Amino acid sequence: XXXXXXXXXXXXXXXXYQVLREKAASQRRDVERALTRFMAKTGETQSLFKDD
Amino acid sequence: ALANSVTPAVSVNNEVRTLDNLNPDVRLILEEITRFLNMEKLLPSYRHTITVSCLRAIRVLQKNGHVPSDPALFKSYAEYGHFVDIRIAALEAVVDYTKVDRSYEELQWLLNMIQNDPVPYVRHKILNMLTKNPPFTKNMESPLCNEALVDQLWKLMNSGTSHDWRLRCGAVDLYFTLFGLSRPSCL
C-alpha cells in the first residue's frame, strides 16, 4: 500500500473536554488581564502601594 | 470569600511597604480584585456591586497590614459623582479607618462632608454606621476629642443641621456614644 494506494488526513481531533474548557477559560483570564493592563497604564491611575 | 481569606500575620516586623511585593497568595488575591475593579470600571454590571465587595476586601487587606493603611483610594470613592452604594461602602470603610487608625484630619473631612453634600442618605448612613462603629470611644479618649472636636460637634448639633430632623438625631446619637451623660472632661 506504501506506493499504490492512498488515504485521507483529517489530523486534528483535539477533543479533550476538561482540557478544552481549561483552554477557553485561561484565554478569558488572559484577555481580562490584558485589557486591565491596557487601561491600567492608559487612563487615570491610582495605586495600592506607592508607584505600582 | 477572598475578603474572608483574612491573613493578619504576614508582616512580622515591617513588611507593609512594597517590600516583598507582599507575598505570596495575597498578591494573587490582589490580581483578581484588581481585575474585577477594572472590569466593573469597563463592563459595569449592576450598581458596581462587585466594586462594593472589592472595596470591602481592600479595607480588610488594610486591616491586616498588607496594602498599607491609606484611605486615599476609599477617599477617591467617597467622592460625589459615583453611585450611592459605592459611596456608602467607602464611607463605611473610612469610618473603620478612622476607628482603628487615628486619622484626625479625615474625621474632620468627614464631618465637613456631613455638613456639606446634597445627598441625604449618605448623611443618614455616615452618622448611622459612624455611631455603630465609632472612633473616640467614650472614656477611652486617647485621640483627644476634648480639644475642639466637642466644640464643632456641639455646633453641628446646633448649627448646620436644621435641614433635616434625623441628621441632628444622629448627632444626638453621636453625643450618646461619645461622652453621653456628662461633661466631656473638658472643664
Side-chain angles (χ1 to χ4, degrees):
Chain A
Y17 176 78
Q18 191 176 6
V19 182
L20 284 174
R21 295 182 178 182
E22 279 165 351
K23 294 291 285 186
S26 61
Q27 193 180 10
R28 188 66 171 172
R29 180 173 179 175
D30 293 333
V31 179
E32 284 174 349
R33 192 168 183 174
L35 180 52
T36 293
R37 286 177 179 173
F38 171 66
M39 294 194 77
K41 291 184 181 181
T42 299
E44 293 182 356
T45 302
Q46 288 192 359
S47 64
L48 302 175
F49 295 159
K50 289 182 181 179
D51 287 332
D52 294 340
Chain B
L2 300 168
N4 210 352
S5 69
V6 177
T7 310
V10 175
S11 67
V12 177
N13 293 319
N14 287 314
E15 287 183 354
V16 192
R17 298 174 183 88
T18 320
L19 295 178
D20 297 336
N21 286 313
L22 301 163
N23 50 0
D25 301 332
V26 180
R27 189 172 183 177
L28 298 171
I29 302 164
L30 286 174
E31 289 186 351
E32 281 177 345
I33 63 171
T34 306
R35 281 177 181 166
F36 281 104
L37 282 171
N38 297 315
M39 282 170 70
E40 289 290 317
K41 193 67 174 179
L42 278 171
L43 284 177
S45 70
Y46 193 72
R47 293 180 174 176
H48 319 276
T49 303
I50 298 167
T51 298
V52 168
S53 64
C54 286
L55 287 173
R56 291 170 185 167
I58 300 162
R59 177 156 178 81
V60 176
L61 290 178
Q62 285 193 1
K63 284 186 177 179
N64 297 321
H66 305 305
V67 173
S69 67
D70 295 329
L73 290 167
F74 296 152
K75 183 72 168 71
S76 62
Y77 276 151
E79 293 172 348
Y80 178 66
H82 293 292
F83 201 72
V84 171
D85 302 338
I86 304 168
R87 196 169 182 179
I88 219 160
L91 290 172
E92 299 171 359
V94 70
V95 158
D96 269 333
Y97 182 76
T98 312
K99 177 184 177 182
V100 171
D101 194 0
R102 194 174 161 177
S103 174
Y104 176 76
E105 306 172 356
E106 287 291 324
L107 176 66
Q108 180 64 41
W109 171 68
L110 176 62
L111 267 70
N112 289 312
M113 196 166 73
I114 292 163
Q115 167 57 44
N116 198 1
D117 52 351
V119 181
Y121 196 75
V122 292
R123 292 179 176 179
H124 176 75
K125 296 294 286 186
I126 285 162
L127 294 170
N128 190 7
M129 289 193 78
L130 182 64
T131 312
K132 294 180 181 179
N133 288 313
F136 278 83
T137 308
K138 181 183 178 180
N139 294 318
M140 298 173 71
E141 184 177 355
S142 63
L144 304 174
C145 191
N146 285 120
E147 300 176 352
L149 189 60
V150 183
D151 301 331
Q152 292 187 357
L153 279 167
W154 181 258
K155 288 179 181 179
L156 280 172
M157 298 186 79
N158 271 314
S159 64
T161 328
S162 67
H163 303 288
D164 298 328
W165 299 107
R166 73 183 182 178
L167 309 174
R168 53 182 59 192
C169 295
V172 167
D173 303 326
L174 292 177
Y175 277 7
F176 175 71
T177 304
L178 312 174
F179 43 89
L181 297 173
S182 70
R183 291 293 186 185
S185 70
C186 293
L187 290 174

